[PDB]
Copies of this chain bind each other. A is one copy, B any other.
Amino acid sequence: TYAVKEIFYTLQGEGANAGRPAVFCRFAGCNLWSGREEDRAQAVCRFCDTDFVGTDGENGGKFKDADALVATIAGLWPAGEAHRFVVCTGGEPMLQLDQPLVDALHAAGFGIAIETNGSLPVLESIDWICVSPKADAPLVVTKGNELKVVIPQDNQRLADYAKLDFEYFLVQPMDGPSRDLNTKLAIDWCKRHPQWRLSMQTHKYLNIP
């Protein structure tokens, strides 16, 4: 059984796969914040830009099993087109993403990405692992495809993240009332430390979901 906030078809806005058509499956619920505003200031992750509470978004709901969820995901892909790609997010997708769902998505011809905060172990059969560490949470996933660090965060040891086992090391400016400022900080960081590259939230500039 899966609790899903919304499922939608768009381009991946972030990370190395930015620009790529993807079905986004947004699981409800996170382990670093309740999703309630009155809780935000005391939460482990306090900067979240996302509504992951409940199952009331587009295509959202409680799915009986993996086949029902996969059916809805596949249904959003253009008929007769391949390159099927799903980005599992949330919320924290590792609270709910399990092997039977991964196997059913693979059997349906999807490549699978995850967006995860890195505080929970990941399924290594996932094809694309994006880890976005939250400075005040544990980081237990220390290898993956891309480490996409939102900056600035207090308590961050940013340069050290670069010792972890990832193919790409990205900084993503924190959105909120200081986005332009954070974007300038992020560009400068990369130019001074070019192991790192910039991940913009391109979907916000394109005004697409």
A: residues with CB less than 8 A from B are 9-11, 16, 18-21, 77-78, 81-85, 170, 183, 187, 190-200, 202, 205-206, 208
Contact = CB atoms under 8 A, between A and B. Distances in A.
A119 B194 CA distance: 32
Contact of A190 (B11, B82, B192): B11
Contacts of A11: 187, 190-191, 197-198
Contacts of A190: 11, 19-21
A130 B159 CA distance: 31
B202 A78 contact: no
A21 B191 contact: yes
A170 B78 contact: no
A10 to B, nearest CB: 8
Nearest to A77: B194
Contacts of A10: 191
Smallest CB-CB A-B distances: 9 pairs: A21-B194, A19-B198, A19-B197, A20-B197, A83-B194, A205-B205, A21-B190, A83-B195, A21-B191
A163 to B, nearest CB: 14
